């Protein structure tokens, strides 16, 4: 078995492979997530649109996962997340909470940063959804190092710093977007600095907005 330590500390205390895995994420496309009072809206800015997968993926009926970075690496994380969500139902009789799913995904990413013979995932994920029988929105983020945290609004990918700067002044944690329209319009405005929108609502009510709806938001802005 190949077990070379690929992720090791540099003399300055840095793990270069994890640092370079983050660079792979920053070259990913987009994942803007705006959490509101009742909404979590996820968005991204000769190809066959029917069969090209949407970036937002349902891990379970109530939890969806968007990502940024290496698409091929993300499929492996999403597959492991879906298997775990089913196993938790199978053995603990309950669907996963958003934090439990986030903890498992970040655990796999952390495991790949200190296992021999493997490189870290070049994937950062935005995990959004609702805990079972619950209604307060959750919006978590994971990174290649394994760090996971909860956000009111977050972006990952190219132009993340510009969009996060835009979010940090248009989003106010004093008064989150009260209406689903405000959740989408803020998300579209951030993505306007092509638009896909997915709205995550309690009781497994996850819907992707149509292009006609998105056009109305864009035209309004």
């Amino acid at each position: 078995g190949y077990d070379r330590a690929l992720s090791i500390f540099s003399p300055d205390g840095h793990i270069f492979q994890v640092e370079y895995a983050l660079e792979a994420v920053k070259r990913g496309t987009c994942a803007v997530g705006v959490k509101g009072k009742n909404c979590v809206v996820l968005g991204c800015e000769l190809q066959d649109t029917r069969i090209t997968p949407s970036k937002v993926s349902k891990i379970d009926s109530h939890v969806v996962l968007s990502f940024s970075g290496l698409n091929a690496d993300s499929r492996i994380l999403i597959e492991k997340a879906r298997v775990e969500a089913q196993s938790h139902r199978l053995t603990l009789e309950d669907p996963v909470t958003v934090e439990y799913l986030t903890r498992y995904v970040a655990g796999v990413q952390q495991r790949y940063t200190q296992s021999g013979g493997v490189r870290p995932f070049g994937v950062s994920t935005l995990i959004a959804g609702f805990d079972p029988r619950d209604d307060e929105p959750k919006l978590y983020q994971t990174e290649p190092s394994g760090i996971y945290s909860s956000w009111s609004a977050q972006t990952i990918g190219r132009n993340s710093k510009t969009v996060r700067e835009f979010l940090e002044k248009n989003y106010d944690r004093k008064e989150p977007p009260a209406t689903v329209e405000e959740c989408v319009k803020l998300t579209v405005r951030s993505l306007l600095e092509n638009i896909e929108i997915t709205v995550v609502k309690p009781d497994s009510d996850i819907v992707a907005l149509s292009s006609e709806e998105i056009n109305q938001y864009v035209t309004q802005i």
Partner: protein
């Protein structure tokens, strides 16, 4: 120990890239051009071979059947491709054994791309130097045209080219492709793109591999005479 001789294939560059994957994509860029065109009534796979004494009528080096409804065009190392093609054939037959249904095209493409990605993240081995074009039919989406590369990324296309002169071929495809062409029109577009992207002075039947999938779905990998027939009527002759 062997640590001094390890090339560290599965590591990131400081720019976030994977050297071996990028070097494997550079390898395919010198391989023969393979083109896939998804028409309204089917898909067209066309590949340019890359000698007088070569047994051309027997050589099948770029187009392979994976199924009764799925075929692949190959760009890159043919020996590496034969390994992946065998697994795809077994995986498609495993799906039919489990569910009594023909495997969906995307499920097969995803499984093959997951094998490619695995060689990119762990194991210490080099990536497969192969790019595929999957032309397939299933009852869910109908005619589907996918492509996959050594990194394990796969994307669906209406028209796509892999191998040498991909940029030139895609420019021609963008100009001349319509969503409502028929297979015969799609066939014609395939040879013109190959003719205007080949490095040789002329395009002849011995340098070509051709395959179509048409509706029940029927896979036809063209014989040299049939390529010769379609070559003349297209006008390239």
């Amino acid at each position: 120990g062997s640590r001094r001789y390890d090339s560290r294939t599965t590591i990131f560059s400081p720019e976030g890239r994977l050297y071996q994957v990028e070097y494997a994509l550079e390898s395919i860029s010198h391989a023969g051009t393979a083109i896939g065109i998804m028409a309204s009534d089917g898909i067209v796979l066309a590949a340019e071979r890359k000698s007088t004494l070569l047994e051309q009528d027997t050589s099948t080096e770029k187009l392979y059947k994976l199924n009764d409804k799925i075929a692949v065009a190959v760009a890159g190392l043919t020996a590496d491709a034969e390994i992946l093609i065998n697994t795809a054939r077994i995986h498609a037959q495993n799906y039919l054994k489990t569910y009594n249904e023909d495997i969906p095209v995307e499920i097969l493409v995803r499984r093959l791309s997951d094998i490619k990605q695995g060689y990119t993240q762990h194991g210490g081995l080099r990536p497969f130097g192969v790019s595929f074009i999957y032309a397939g039919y299933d009852d869910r989406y109908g005619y589907q045209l996918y492509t996959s590369n050594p990194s394990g990324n796969y994307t669906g296309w209406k028209a796509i080219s892999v191998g040498a002169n991909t940029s030139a071929a895609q420019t021609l495809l963008q100009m001349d492709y319509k969503d409502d062409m028929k297979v015969d029109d799609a066939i014609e577009l395939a040879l013109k793109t190959l003719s205007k992207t080949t490095d040789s002075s002329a395009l002849t039947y011995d340098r070509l591999e051709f395959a179509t999938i048409r509706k029940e779905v029927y896979q036809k990998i063209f014989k040299p005479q049939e390529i010769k027939d379609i070559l003349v009527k297209t006008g390239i002759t």
